[PDB]
Design a protein around this ligand. Structure first.
Ligand SMILES: *[C@@H]1O[C@H](CO)[C@@H](O[C@@H]2O[C@H](CO)[C@@H](O)[C@H](O)[C@H]2NC(C)=O)[C@H](O)[C@H]1NC(C)=O
Ligand SMILES: COc1cc(OC)c(NC(=O)Nc2cc(C)on2)cc1Cl
Ligand SMILES: COc1cc(OC)c(NC(=O)Nc2cc(C)on2)cc1Cl
Ligand SMILES: COc1cc(OC)c(NC(=O)Nc2cc(C)on2)cc1Cl
Ligand SMILES: COc1cc(OC)c(NC(=O)Nc2cc(C)on2)cc1Cl
Ligand SMILES: *[C@@H]1O[C@H](CO)[C@@H](O)[C@H](O)[C@H]1NC(C)=O
Ligand SMILES: *[C@@H]1O[C@H](CO)[C@@H](O)[C@H](O)[C@H]1NC(C)=O
Ligand SMILES: *[C@@H]1O[C@H](CO)[C@@H](O)[C@H](O)[C@H]1NC(C)=O
Ligand SMILES: *[C@@H]1O[C@H](CO)[C@@H](O)[C@H](O)[C@H]1NC(C)=O
Ligand SMILES: [Ca+2]
Lengths: 377, 374, 373, 377, 378
């Protein structure tokens, strides 16, 4: 009875094209915020951020005011899209094909004229994804909201702190915070200034997932490659092991490619580690060729270098604590074999040490390594 | 004749914005339920659940009442979207790009003003998937339905038990149940409390596909890896087999990885078992390299250590001219390589059987999964 | 001229929300059928069927009638969605994200009030796919159509048979038929019974494509694996061959898993075939490890058992019409060769026997080889 | 001033549902054509053709006529969707999820009443793709256009020759033409005939892309397989080479399989060529096994067969101009090695002949192959 | 209060179908431009360009004018889609399924009647991604905008320079510029010429990514192939390493064919380079078989020719500074064959290395944009 009358009376002469201000010269103050419900996807390959966001817009409509005493029990009213004025706040740095992922819901208006509009939306936003420190990366993704057509002279956008109470954790990204900033920017379209509210979601990738799927396995497979230098040369599988492991390590980097944006702004940390790892094992094959070349050096062929004869069978042999014509061929060849064995032991120490130092050096360079090991392991 | 008059009479002064109550201070009782016709997909990667559902919403419109005696033969009427008041009951935890996958069908009203609205939909809901027990995992996915802008003071949402009569089994997911719970939450936006209807779909994965397509094949590939310790050393291909099988076992992790999300909440059981299997194969390859070093040992190198000469050639063995004399030392080494192979075959077999069983029987749902599915 | 008059007359006091019957008690007979223009996809992984369908709905509208003598030359009118009552006939089992893939077109009414409505559509239906016999399957995919909000007491659905005159061949599926049936079923929601029409599209998979790209190719790589037995053991690559071919067979299995649903209601015939190929090639690897063990036997190890002696190197050799340390090893190398032969014949009969049975156990096999080869 | 008058005057009593004719008994003549702007994609796997088209629909509205003298400077008017009658000319064999991909634009009407409607669209269209001669294939994709609900008695559809002046090439297909055909067809629904206009886009594939990516790499890697025969037997890597080559020659069959539909009407030419190649390579593996059986033959085994002694060591040995107890063993085994060696060289030439013959024959079985090599190479 | 009055007065008799000119015979001047906010994607495979674009259309509506003195504080009004006349400027060469990705926003009209309309949009345009010089490639994508139904007689389209003010860098594409051009062309449909504004965004590819993912790895794994010529023959592993490397060189080229279109207009630089290295490594495999023929050469086989005995063991040997009785003769003869095998290994190492150096460097510098690419990205 009374609610029918109110709906009939609130829409008499009401024009949804009119900014609902009593004085036209004063700007309308609209309080903007958002509730970040979930970070569903951070598409690093496309540099996109898909998030479930409930925007919160509250303002004061001068025309939708009534006595609750004269309309008993009617304390709130609801209006749909297109029957009431609404602020045309839009996400400037959108990546969504329709550019407006917001789902239009009712606006709730109470008797003092205060209108409240909370449209849910799967907002897809264009974010610069800094992949320098991946996986140990902290992203600062900006969500920039502002009126598309109303400037500061008309629509006085005002911040309110973002809600995280209803946030459901992701599992891959650990929300560090969502600080917001209100600025009054000038654009080359227009002379009227435009205010905006930018929320910088600061997300810390939890590293257990890719710590284990990508980095730990690479290290153990690179260790499998180091076994090459203990394999006896006469086995015949010295290099097979080296080349087969190498293709296993390539499938790890093809998988990084599946997610890495096509940018050239910087070299991701993991790429540096895999690049250094691959070259180290690639160099393992090279020294493998040389030790085999030494192992098989024709007996009758040109005698051994004196330098070699000291640098491997006198000094390096002692450091590591190792110690008829056909017979001399076997004796000369056996010395070639002994040099080969010493080079095998030498390069194991050196490539193992180079692997260890390289591994920690590249990994420990990340300012998030200490943090990530502390929280995520 | 009468149907035309009824339709013309029911839309006089009707306001689809008005809540169709007689007393404005009392709320409107809306009975909510759903019929889960199917569970179409469970995208563990995007953490989404695609289900075919018919929402059921039944209430009373005070204004769409007619006395049937005067309208003979017109027992019901039908109204489309935007001509009748409807409760804006949305899925809060929606993961659909439009956020409302519901299809707006008609509202059927009988003469007592009772309205019935059953929109079909393919709902995408944002589910936390607990992947710790994968594949022997049970999921509790919530579908939380509520009026977006009507609090309890206006719309008294009341749950009715879910229907599964027409449910079409999925083949991967055995509907364990769809227990529901109502509630009256409070939001930071607003002071008026808001009620909601949460159905916690309880789904048990059916473990035959993933049992036979990944877990069992992985066991047999690890067995092919174990085969190394039965190969004669002189064959010249111990390492070839060992490494071609270690790299092959990665395949399974690629498929496991393209199905499972990238959360760091926990380590999936499938991941633990595959990691243990690959680590066992890697330790087999390492043992293989020590065996090859023993086998291809230069006779004029070091003398055989006493510890080695008893721990391998005497105890384990019992439990289970210069060229000539050089041949015999190298012979001893070949025997020691054989003893290490046999000892390590036994030990690696025991760990594989233990590890896989120990890991698989760690799942609370393993016994039920095996008995019901295999 | 007469069009303007008829179109103005036919819409006076017309309410599209009014089922168009003269008497409100009797039901409205709506004839439903469909034209199946193509089977675009059978997404087996998703258990969905995507089809080109022209639904065919005919009924009679009491109010939309006239005298052609008073509107000469005006023998039909057409109305767009929104201005004429229409049966809300939906596909209940619809997998499309929208739930109504129908494209809304005009309703054509002739002067006796008979309205004809043929909306085209790309219909995705949630179909259960019976994969036990894949690739020799006969999918019975159901398209269940009916009014969403009119019961039998109000809308008397009736079904004419489906059209296939314009049906285009698919190349993967032979339309075995599209029979239909009317079913007046009761729902737990409501007491008024609701009629539905179900068209059971019966599709026979043309097995030449898959047979050529999955089954036949596998047989030959399994034979390639069997060639291990007859390699001389001195070559040095017996297990190399075995392991390579067995990995390739895994390539095949990954493909067939890319195309087979994730269902525990049965095991596809194809899966059982690859599982048994790789099982046999696995046991080829095992017996070849035993063979190498025999070949690389230490002459100073154990003496040959009389069982190993007469079983393998007397009787088994006999049938197949085939210095001391070298002699002892020579006896051992001959053991490897007889195991090589014996295993061939034995594994070969398995190879041939198994497949033929796994394959010929499908009821559709004879038809498949006769029609698709 | 006058444009407002004319727009206000052309909407008096107008009904967008009326067929705009003076006499209700004579059919309206609609001239239909299309401008094919680009063939954006040919989804062979889905049997779909995605094309950029500007359909051209021209007719005469009896009611939208004025004299430009009374409305000076107003020679044309424009009406958007839902305000003017437009023919419901759809694409019968459409594959788009929404069926009508046309983007609805304005209808331009001049003073004499002639209306012109050129809506752009991305028309997905079910095309039977004959893959028998792929990559050397010519496709005839039909776009069948017609009025959905007007028969020949109401809408007399008429053909205007298609436009390809503004066609920009595709890069994968060479437009042979787009000849049309107007038919008057009867349907099982109804008695009234329906005229339709069918354009048969004829496309010739440009084969250099697949020519260099799928074809020549197969010939090359196959020659690399044939190198197996020239290795000496003692290397101990013949079998590994053959299998490595074959399992990697399977790469191209899983790759081409990524694009072709699952049709069983016929067998693709590329598939026939790959199958022949694989049969030849597998037979090379088989003969490699036989050659190793010859080479690693125990001397004390069976005696050399007489037929073997002659067919290899006497006739073939001359066709290719080839030529104590322990001592006899290598002599017998040396005959076996020459037997193995003559077989290797013989079969090298024989398998080589099969490769060139099979490749040339199979490739030359495509009728337009001569045109292909003359235009794309 | 006054804004209600103005909105009620501006729509009295207004018709959104009418072009808002006072003189019907004079074309309406529409100033068109755009702001390029991001190059969201360049899909070379599908031949598409996805861009974040804010179009700018400005014109003068004769009917939406008022003096602000009579409407104090109301200096600007805003009309949504379907309430005000708007220019139907579409993107001709669009590849979007709906053909028009523009998001319809309000039109802002100030007190002098000047209307300004800035619809944002994720525009998908059908581009000719020339790919002969990939990865050192410069792409010219044209975005042609123009009224779909109005010619130069009714709507005088006028270009305004484009902007890159808020161009958010992409990381893969260095925007070289967005020069525009206004043309007046005739079409086979009509007798009225239709003006258009074509913006030709020129984008240079930053080659660091695909340079170290494809160009460089190939060089290093091809070096691994070259290692075959250093392997001793006695190891009996030359063929394994050679073939395994040459099979692992196709994985990259499969990703190379996963990004670039299947066009047959030109052969990409990357494809030429990959073919050249693949031919060189395959020739390494062929030579590996030949040297193995030399190495495992039966001593009782064919006698050494006097050409191979001088062309390898005398001249080419001298260049590189290499330096029971029946069995001894047999082993000595085989050792000459083994020596011949070694000389061919060393020669082919040098020859294939030089052919790799030349081929790699020459082909890579054949791109016009190579010096600039290496100078900016390294
Ligand atoms: C409405 O807006 C237009 C454009 O913003 C204004 O016209 C411009 O005014 C500036 C200021 O002097 C001039 O420099 C430009 O040359 C003008 N351009 C055009 C196309 O007119 C116009 O003045 C504004 N109206 C009012 C009442 O301020
Ligand atoms: C390609 O090769 C691999 C790929 C992998 O995934 C992408 C993994 N993944 C893995 O080890 N994941 C684990 C381990 C544990 C415990 O939990 N998750 C391993 C290899 Cl070798
Ligand atoms: C890589 O290696 C494999 C991969 C596989 O798929 C991913 C399977 N799959 C399999 O065995 N699937 C079955 C068996 C039966 C019966 O039913 N489905 C096997 C291997 Cl070896
Ligand atoms: C992985 O390995 C293969 C994969 C294949 O496709 C999926 C095929 N396909 C094939 O042989 N297709 C043919 C043959 C003929 C004649 O026609 N189509 C073969 C192998 Cl080996
Ligand atoms: C298939 O084989 C590879 C594939 C690759 O990616 C596609 C890479 N990629 C790579 O090296 N990327 C780097 C290196 C550094 C430093 O930074 N990014 C390497 C190989 Cl071997
Ligand atoms: C409906 O109409 C009949 C006929 O006049 C009347 O007797 C009956 O009381 C009416 N129903 C109600 C609830 O008043
Ligand atoms: C319709 O009108 C005509 C005259 O216009 C009349 O002859 C005819 O009888 C009417 N209806 C019938 C019964 O066909
Ligand atoms: C238009 O006006 C001219 C001049 O008054 C007249 O000659 C001509 O016939 C008119 N055309 C029409 C609408 O018949
Ligand atoms: C607008 O009003 C002012 C004062 O009310 C008047 O002086 C002016 O002339 C008016 N505008 C025009 C264009 O005349
Ligand atoms: Ca890219």
């Amino acid at each position: 009875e009374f609610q029918r009358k109110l709906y009939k009376e609130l829409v008499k002469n009401y024009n949804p094209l009119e900014r609902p201000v009593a004085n036209d010269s004063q700007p309308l103050t609209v309080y903007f915020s958002l509730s970040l419900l979930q970070i569903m996807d951070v598409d690093e390959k496309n540099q996109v951020l898909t998030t479930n966001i409930w925007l919160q817009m509250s303002w004061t409509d001068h025309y939708l005011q009534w006595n609750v005493s004269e309309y008993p029990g009617v304390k709130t009213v609801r209006f749909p899209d297109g029957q009431i004025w609404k602020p045309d706040i839009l996400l400037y740095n959108s990546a969504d094909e329709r550019f407006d992922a917001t789902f239009h819901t009712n606006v709730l208006v109470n008797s003092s004229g205060h209108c409240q509009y909370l449209p849910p939306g799967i907002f897809k936003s264009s974010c610069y994804i800094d992949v320098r420190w991946f996986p140990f990366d902290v992203q600062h993704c900006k969500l920039k909201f502002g009126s598309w057509s109303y400037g500061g002279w008309s629509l006085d956008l005002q911040m309110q702190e973002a809600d995280i109470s209803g946030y459901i954790p992701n599992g891959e990204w650990d929300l560090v915070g969502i600080p917001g900033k209100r600025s009054e920017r000038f654009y080359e379209c227009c002379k009227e200034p435009y205010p905006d509210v930018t929320f910088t979601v600061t997300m810390r990738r939890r590293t257990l997932y890719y710590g284990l799927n990508l980095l730990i396995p690479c290290v153990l497979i690179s260790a499998l490659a180091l076994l090459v230098f203990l394999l006896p040369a006469d086995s015949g599988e010295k290099i097979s092991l080296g080349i087969t492991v190498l293709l296993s390590l390539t499938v790890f980097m093809l998988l990084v490619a599946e997610i890495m944006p096509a940018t050239s702004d910087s070299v991701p940390l993991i790429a540096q580690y895999f690049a250094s790892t691959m070259i180290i094992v690639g160099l393992s094959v090279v020294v493998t060729v040389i030790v085999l070349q030494y192992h098989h050096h024709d007996p009758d062929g040109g005698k051994m270098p004196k330098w070699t004869r000291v640098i491997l069978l006198n000094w390096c042999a002692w450091f590591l604590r190792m110690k008829r014509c056909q017979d001399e061929s076997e004796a000369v060849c056996s010395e070639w074999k002994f040099a080969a064995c010493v080079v095998d032991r030498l390069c194991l120490m050196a490539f193992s040490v180079f692997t260890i130092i390289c591994t920690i050096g590249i990994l420990m360079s990340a300012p998030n390594f200490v943090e990530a090991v502390s929280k995520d392991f």
